[PDB]
Structure formats: C-alpha cells, structure tokens
Amino acid sequence: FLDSLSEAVRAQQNDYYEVAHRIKEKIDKQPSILVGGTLKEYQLRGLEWMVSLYNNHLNGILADEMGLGKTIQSISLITYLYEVKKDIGPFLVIVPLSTITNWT
Ligand SMILES: Nc1ncnc2c1ncn2[C@@H]1O[C@H](COP(=O)(O)OP(=O)(O)O)[C@@H](O)[C@H]1O
Numbered sequence: 001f002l003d004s005l006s007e008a009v010r011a012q013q014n015d016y017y018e019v020a021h022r023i024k025e026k027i028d029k030q031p032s033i034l035v036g037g038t039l040k041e042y043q044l045r046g047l048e049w050m051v052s053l054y055n056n057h058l059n060g061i062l063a064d065e066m067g068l069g070k071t072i073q074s075i076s077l078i079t080y081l082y083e084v085k086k087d088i089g090p091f092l093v094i095v096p097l098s099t100i101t102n103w104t
C-alpha cells in the first residue's frame with residue numbers, strides 16, 4: 001500500500017512515516033497574520049504535520065481529542081500557507097450550523 005501510495009504521491013508531484021513525510025518542513029514561529037494570542041507547542045507541531053502533508057500531497061485527519069484548538073490550528077494552516085506558499089484562495093471550510101459563529 002505504502003509503495004503504491006508513495007508512487008501515487010509521486011504522480012501527485014507531477015518505513016511509513018519518513019516515506020509519507022519525505023518532504024519535511026518545520027517552523028518555530030506561528031504565522032505573522034495570527035493575532036489574539038499564541039499557539040501552543042503541540043499546535044505548532046500539528047501545523048508542521050499538516051504542512052508536511054501539504055508538501056507530500058497527502059490528506060489527513062486532526063484526531064486530537066477535544067477542545068484542543070483545532071479551529072485555531074486550521075486558521076493557522078490557512079495563514080501559514082498564505083504566508084509561505086502564498087496560494088491565497090480558494091479555500092473552503094465546512095462546519096455544522098451550530099458552530100458557524102464560533103468559527104467566524
Ligand atoms: N493557542 C491557544 N491560545 C488561546 N486559546 C486557545 C488556544 N488553543 C485553544 N484555545 C481555546 O480553545 C478555543 C479554540 O478552540 P476550541 O474550539 O476550544 O477547540 P476546538 O477548536 O479544538 O474545538 C478558544 O476558546 C481558546 O480559548
């Protein structure tokens with residue numbers, strides 16, 4: 001699976017972990033767009049993890065327990081990408097109606 005997957009990734013470029021995360025990147029600072037507080041270490045790790053997925057053309061799941069700032073992390077993802085990759089738009093977020101204004 002991994003072999004064919006990594007080859008699928010190579011098509012998308014046109015152990016398991018290091019293979020899946022062949023392209024790496026990390027960042028000590030949060031995206032400068034972000035205001036209203038700072039990110040927690042693990043959130044930063046999560047960001048880096050998501051960034052790695054981006055770099056390796058992989059999709060993934062933020063399965064961190066609950067109430068751990070994923071909303072913020074996804075926002076930081078947006079701003080990260082905009083400050084680093086600079087592909088501003090089009091970016092879609094889909095949420096429950098009961099959570100709309102929490103997100104806004
Ligand atoms: N780095 C952070 N700085 C400040 N508050 C945070 C941070 N991470 C999480 N929070 C708290 O959690 C909320 C944001 O995420 P929340 O909705 O609580 O969890 P999730 O986004 O995982 O559902 C905010 O109310 C905030 O107070």
Ligand code: BEF
Pocket residue numbers: 065066067068069070071
């Ligand atoms: F992941 Be949060 F608790 F919506």
